[PDB]
Structures are given as C-alpha cells and as structure tokens.
Write a protein that binds this ligand. Sequence first.
Ligand SMILES: CN1CCN(Cc2ccc(C(=O)Nc3cccc(Nc4nccc(-c5cccnc5)n4)c3)cc2)CC1
Length: 452
Amino acid sequence: MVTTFVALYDYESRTETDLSFKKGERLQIVNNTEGDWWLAHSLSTGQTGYIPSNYVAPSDSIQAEEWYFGKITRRESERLLLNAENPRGTFLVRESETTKGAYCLSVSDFDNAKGLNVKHYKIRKLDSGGFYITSRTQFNSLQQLVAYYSKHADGLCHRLTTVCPTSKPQTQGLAKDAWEIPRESLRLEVKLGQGCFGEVWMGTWNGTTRVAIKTLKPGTMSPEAFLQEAQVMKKLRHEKLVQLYAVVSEEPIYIVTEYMSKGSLLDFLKGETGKYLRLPQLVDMAAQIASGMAYVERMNYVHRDLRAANILVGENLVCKVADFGLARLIEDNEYTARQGAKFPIKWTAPEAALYGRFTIKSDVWSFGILLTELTTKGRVPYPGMVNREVLDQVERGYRMPCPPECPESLHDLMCQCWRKEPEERPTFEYLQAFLEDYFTSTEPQYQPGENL
Ligand SMILES: CN1CCN(Cc2ccc(C(=O)Nc3cccc(Nc4nccc(-c5cccnc5)n4)c3)cc2)CC1
C-alpha cells in the first residue's frame, strides 16, 4: 500500500514532536521525499510525530518482514543465529547463494551431545509462483511458508519459534523540537566548572537573559543520554526546581537553564555565609527543597541523586532542586540500574543500593541525609566511616546521631526518613508542612546558639 510503511525496530520518543512506535507497527508517511526524519501517523495509535527514516520499510516490500535478512551469506546467517540467548528454532529467511532466485530458511538447532548448530533449507520457486522446501508442500508466499512452519516442523529440525534478533542502527542525527535554539543566541562568559562529561558556564541568551549552559564533551556519553536531563525538565516545572530554557542538539550539545547566582548548597554552607546561619534559616531552606520534592512526588517522578551538592542557591536563601541527570518517570516494573546510580553511597537507601529499587521513598531517605548536611553546615555524612563500610552498617541498623545544637525533634524527623521499610517513611508532602510549621508547631521555645 503506497504511503504505508512498517517499522523494522522499536523507537522511544525523546522530544515533544517525535513518535514512539514498536517494530511491526504500520505508519502513514505521505512525504518521504527526504531528510533523515519523516512525519508519520500511526495506524495503530492514531498518533502523529517524527520518525527516523532508517527505521521503516515500505509496506509492499519483503523488507517489511522482520525475519527477512536479504543478501547475507550462509556463514553470516550462522553467526547471527548462534547467539547464546536464541531459543531453539530461531530463524531467518535470506537469499540463496547457490541457486539464483531461490531463498533459504536458516534455523538454530541443538545436538544433545555437541551443542548449538544451524540447519539450512533451500526455498525454491516455481513458474506458477509457488514457494517450497519440499515439492509436496507449496505456498503462494514466503509469508505463508513461514506461518506454516511456525505451526508444525513437518520435516524441519524444529518448529520456527523466534525471529532472529539483530542490532538496532543509530538514528541519523537527533530529533529536535521547539526547545531548540540557534547557538548564535548564546554568549559564554564565565566557566563555572568542568569534569569528565563536559563543562558548565554562565552566559547570556538573546543578549538579555542570564543563563547557565551545561555542555557535553564529545566521545563521553551519548547526546541522547545527556539530553535525558532536558526531557525531564520539559515536564517538571515548579518554583523550587531549576527551570529549563532551551537546548542545542548538535555537538557540542548544550542544555540552557536559569542561572542560580550562589552555586551549590554544599559550597554555600561551607563558605562564609554558613557561619552566620542558624536553625531558622536552615529549616527554611529544607522546607523549600521539600516543596520541590513534593512536586516531583505528585508528578510521579524520582530524582535519584538528591544531596546538597545538587541543590542550587540564589540570593536570599532561595534553594532549588537541580541535576535531573538521573531522574526518571516511575514505571510499574523493575529495571537493571546502571552501576553508577547508587553512588555516592552515603545518600542512597539500602533497597536502592542493593536491589535497584529507586522510588520516591528512596529520595526521602536521601532527604534525611541532606538534613544532616544542613544542620552540620556541609559535613560529610557518617564521619569517620569509609564508603565501603556504609551499606553493611546501615543495613544492620546504624543511624547518624543527633548533630550538636540540633533539636531532638528534627533528628526524629531524620530518623523517620531512614526507616528500614520504605512505606513507613514520610511523604515529601508531610515533610514540607512539618518544616514550614516547625517554629510554631514543634519548637515554639527555640532560641539560637552559636551554631544553630
Ligand atoms: C567532584 N565534581 C567534579 C566536577 N565538578 C564540576 C563543577 C564544579 C563546580 C561547579 C560550580 O561551582 N557551579 C556553580 C557556581 C556558581 C553558580 C552556579 N550556578 C548554576 N546555576 C544554574 C545551573 C547550574 C548548573 C551547575 C552544574 C550543572 N548543571 C547546571 N549552576 C554554579 C559546577 C560544576 C563538580 C564536582
């Protein structure tokens, strides 16, 4: 059907105007003139958006079939079919190397004594239009031949089970949306920092707006992985979260956000202003962070990297949640976490660190640890304890004690955040209200000392 295409691979949406689809999905594309990105409309979901043109095939063509591998050699088909995880009966169809115009069905098999091997069955074509492996069983299409042998082996080594898996190709360039800006609209002014994955600058946007510009060093993480952070920030908008302004999706990749003039909360606490802060100021900062996290909570997201180093500060003790580089929408299943997500370990709840169960409740644990950073003015959690020993201690019941000059009621709040069972930890909704009302509802007799 001309203008109908079939997806060869899965594609996940990563902008506001691209289209998610699954392999085998049928899509209308009425202008396939060119570019590497085509406007498509799904005949399954009725959704419209842009798709990578190398991920689809015309619906008429044999190339639309997932099991059709075209012109590959006998030996290359074997290499693909002998993948360690393929079930017995994994298969593909390809051109025959030995008979012009014929095809070949190649199938993974298993010898109980000798192990994995591949069998090949030549598919010949008649003048009548038929296809066959054996003369007695003919079909009008490769599709019907495959369908039949997926029901019964009928002479083959095994019934056809699984279509041979293969590598998904990269898209040609990244999908872009209305957050994209021309790089000429930016001037880099002051370099704020740098690390293994790039740099952060203070700059100006459109000649008028002060911004922070996070840059990706090429050859480190993928542009897609880097921009996951911007994808999250397009959806999460709140006064106590750092705001996304724009992206530049060609190398070097930029993420452009609002600029927070005082830098990280950790450095702010350790610096000269920390000496002049007392409990009311620190609790107010905690409440602001809790308000941001209560929004993240309501929106069904998880941050996964909450700590004072990832809060940013402005004038007048304004605090905002930042660094959404690990943040995720919560899904009702498990996933294999990256080895790096659990670090730094002193902020990570045991069930997140041990089993990869990162939830809003593991963010609550991290918030409790953040409360210790506030009340000690930036001391490292678990002082005297090396990173390698922390998990075992916490698992066995060890909790940090009440910091000097910290009211017992605030340490009791920290301890609730560190409950062994995640469900027994408070919500950020509760934490925000508690901290906002602290000096009227909880400590109405408070008087400052020299530190808190
Ligand atoms: C161990 N690790 C090694 C690599 N290193 C890189 C680094 C170091 C310092 C800063 C900093 O002081 N930033 C700073 C200073 C003054 C103001 C701001 N303001 C600001 N405003 C908005 C966004 C951002 C920002 C910061 C970091 C990442 N992305 C956005 N920063 C930032 C930023 C990045 C971090 C530590």
